[PDB]
């Protein structure tokens, strides 16, 4: 009775222009003001491949331990829908830029290496606001460079799924190709789950979970779905292929449709884009353009600068945080002092003040001091109560 589940994740690359069009990737509040004949799918327009988007797509795939393709072409994924004007999304089918990678995660128990089967480049769709009995369509976001990441169906529980999204988000975040924030849509996720009673190869019903907007939220639907088809398997259940929407308020998944077969997207090579031949040199440039990722950054905090377990995980949760910590470290802040100060204190200050821009406020130059004034200068902690906040949203030193 393993509940087998895989995750389909899209990430928004933060480039200047769109994937196949020069239109800017960042738009204002005025609808359909961030477009051109290309994004509008006018007759006779052609796609022009954003070079950086490729460099970043293959930068994030390496950081994902994937084999980088040498030959990689784009394909059309054909489907009719108001926010997809050409009626085909330029994507990749065979030859995805990145294949067979993995990430290590820690779930109750120990380490589990989850495989990531592929990483391909795509273009985002426009937005369709449902107003009245009609629909409003804004093509401002259409064409925004996305990358699709599909896990191998290895994760084995709604919690492993969370751990997955966290590490993944974490690693992508370090490559500096996306803010990968789900509240901002720069990271999206869909889950696929099915149960197969032990001893046999046959599965029960399989479902695609839609409308999962937060790490925390995927787990909810995942574990709800798990229980939902857990009953179905036992009670009587009618095996089937389905898509399900997750209701944020009620916490349940609702059946929105029953697949009649496999969605036919008539995939086929995009003749308008000449193939990509990614050579060694090219792979090198982008290879080297990768920092030390979280895992090896954390393994660095273990024996060298021998810090704890909890500590290592949260200080490497973001590149900025981890950079801040190490910048503040040489500066003169005792290893532990700053660790405990970032772990909680600053982390709690950020969350409580939503001051997520850990960069345009308190700095390692400024913070470095406070810890010394406490270290020995003046004496101990309680003073740290408010010295910190002011020092964080205001000045430069004590």
């Amino acid at each position: 009775f393993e509940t087998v589940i895989g995750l389909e994740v899209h990430v928004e690359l933060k480039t200047d222009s769109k994937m196949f069009s020069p239109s800017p990737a960042h738009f204002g509040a005025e609808p359909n003001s961030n477009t051109n004949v290309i994004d509008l799918a006018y007759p006779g327009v052609l796609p022009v491949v954003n070079k950086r988007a490729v460099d970043w797509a293959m930068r994030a795939a390496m950081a994902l331990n994937m084999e980088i393709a040498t030959e990689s072409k784009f394909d059309r994924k054909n489907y009719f829908y108001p926010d997809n004007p050409k009626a085909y999304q330029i994507s990749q089918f065979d030859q995805p830029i990145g294949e067979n990678g993995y990430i290590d995660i820690e779930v109750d128990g120990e380490t589990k290496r989850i495989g990531i089967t592929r990483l391909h480049m795509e273009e985002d769709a426009g937005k369709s606001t449902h107003k009245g009995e009609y629909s409003l369509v804004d093509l401002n976001r259409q064409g925004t460079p996305l990358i699709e990441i599909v896990s191998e169906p290895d994760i084995r529980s709604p919690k492993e799924a969370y751990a997955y999204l966290e590490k993944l988000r974490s690693i992508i975040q370090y490559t500096g190709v996306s803010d990968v924030k789900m509240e901002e849509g720069s990271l999206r996720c869909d889950a696929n789950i099915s149960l197969r009673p032990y001893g046999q190869e046959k599965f029960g019903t399989k479902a695609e979970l839609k409308n999962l907007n937060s790490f925390n939220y995927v787990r909810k639907g995942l574990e709800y779905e798990e229980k939902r088809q857990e009953e179905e398997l036992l009670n009587g259940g009618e095996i089937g292929q389905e898509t399900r929407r997750f209701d944020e308020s009620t916490g349940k998944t609702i059946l929105m449709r029953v697949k009649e077969g496999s969605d036919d997207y008539r995939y086929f090579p995009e003749p308008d884009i000449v193939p990509l031949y990614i050579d060694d040199a090219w792979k090198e440039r982008v290879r080297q353009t990768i920092p030390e990722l979280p895992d090896e950054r954390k393994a660095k905090y273990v024996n060298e600068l021998g810090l704890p377990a909890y500590d290592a995980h949260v200080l490497t949760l973001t590149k900025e945080m981890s950079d801040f910590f190490e910048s503040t470290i040489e500066h003169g802040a005792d290893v532990k002092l700053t660790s405990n100060w970032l772990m909680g204190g600053v982390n709690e200050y950020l969350n409580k003040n939503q001051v997520e821009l850990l960069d345009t406020k308190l700095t390692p130059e400024n913070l470095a001091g406070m810890i010394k004034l406490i270290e020995d200068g003046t004496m101990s902690s309680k003073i740290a109560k408010k010295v910190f906040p002011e020092l964080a949203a205001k000045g430069g030193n004590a």
């Binding site: 800017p24 609808p31 359909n32 629909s135 884009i273």
Partner: protein, 99 residues
């Protein structure tokens, strides 16, 4: 040979083309004749031949990531027959009769 009403209507659907059961029959035959016409390629020996996706042997034609401001909303809506509030207006009643 053997192209049913059912496939004719499944294709029409994949193509978003409206057809009447007074056009389906007519289309079943047409496709059939066209396919028989298409079947001619089967007399060609392609064992081990790679598919030609591109005739011109170019490579890596990429565009530098430099944005170019888009056209005015006015220009973007200028040709659309239905619009409201600076967007394209369309029906969306999701009932499996209409859709």
């Amino acid at each position: 040979t053997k192209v049913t009403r059912e496939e004719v209507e499944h294709i029409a659907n994949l193509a978003r083309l409206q057809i009447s059961p007074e056009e389906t029959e007519e289309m079943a035959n047409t496709l059939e004749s066209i396919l028989d016409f298409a079947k001619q390629n089967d007399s060609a020996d392609t064992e081990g031949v790679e598919p030609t996706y591109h005739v011109l042997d170019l490579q890596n034609v990429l565009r530098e990531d430099k944005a170019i401001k888009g056209i005015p909303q006015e220009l973007a809506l200028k040709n659309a027959k239905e619009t409201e509030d600076g967007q394209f207006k369309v029906p969306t009643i999701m009932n499996e009769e209409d859709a």
